[PDB]
Amino acid sequence: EADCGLRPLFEKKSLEDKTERELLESYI
Amino acid sequence: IVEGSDAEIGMSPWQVMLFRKSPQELLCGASLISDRWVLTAAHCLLYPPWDKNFTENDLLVRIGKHSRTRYERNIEKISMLEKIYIHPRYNWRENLDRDIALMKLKKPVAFSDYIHPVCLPDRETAASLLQAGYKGRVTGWGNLKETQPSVLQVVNLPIVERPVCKDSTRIRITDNMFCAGYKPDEGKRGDACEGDSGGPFVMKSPFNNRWYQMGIVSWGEGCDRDGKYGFYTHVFRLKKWIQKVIDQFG
Amino acid sequence: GDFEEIPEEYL
Ligand SMILES: N[C@H](Cc1ccccc1)C(=O)N1CCC[C@H]1C(=O)NCc1cccc(F)c1
Ligand code: NA
Ligand code: NA
After folding, report:
1. Catalytic residues (chain B)?
2. Segment (H or E) for B126
């Protein structure tokens, strides 16, 4: 859907979860 | 999930629990991909070596959950299945090739803070993210070791090079699978386990900051063994089937 | 079997 993959309690509020940065850092 | 952590509230709002009606118990994980479609592993539904062959009326879908055992009043939603669709070339006889199935819900589920679909990848997102060393996340309520959590567990795992995948097992691996996990020298560990089956392997795209489901928890020899890896159904590789089914059965 | 009974209506 149009809104898929955007979590209401995180991306929609511009809040990050505690370990998502570990994924980003791996995307080299 | 072995060597994971408790999920945060709302961290995986696409997580689905496949639940047996009688006796009431967890069967498998799954994911929400729209207001009426749930994605899982075929082996969750059909596995004749273990005399497993579930029909729609044997099961329910529980969505929006955190606690494994608790009935999460005013938060989870429980849905009935309208129809199960298993990949017509699912290889239960040999290696779980094409280990994928769709479930259509009787009624649309209501999205909330805790209930929300995950995206399925396009070719370009898959080509960009499914690289050795890139990490995904897997979630579930299965066992914490190979011989139960209070709440949903989460673990981040790197995609492993196909030659390492191949050389770690005697099973024949196919292009419809990928493996993930840390190497013995890598120190860090974690894995999926029994009951995590059918749950999503997700990655957060750095291009549009959306979560994509790249894999389905499929098989592994043991759980969190050195030199072994978990194997995941390659969702993008089976997307054409997924779309036909959805395009066909609305 | 450590599962809390669910509302009968979904059964
Ligand atoms: N232990 C088998 C290995 C196998 C693989 C292919 C064909 C036959 C047997 C297995 O994982 N199976 C037997 C059929 C179901 C699946 C399973 O337990 N999958 C759950 C699981 C555990 C551990 C890791 C993982 F990624 C997934
Ligand atoms: Na091999
Ligand atoms: Na391992």
Report:
1. 43 (charge relay system), 99 (charge relay system), 197 (charge relay system)
2. helix B123-129
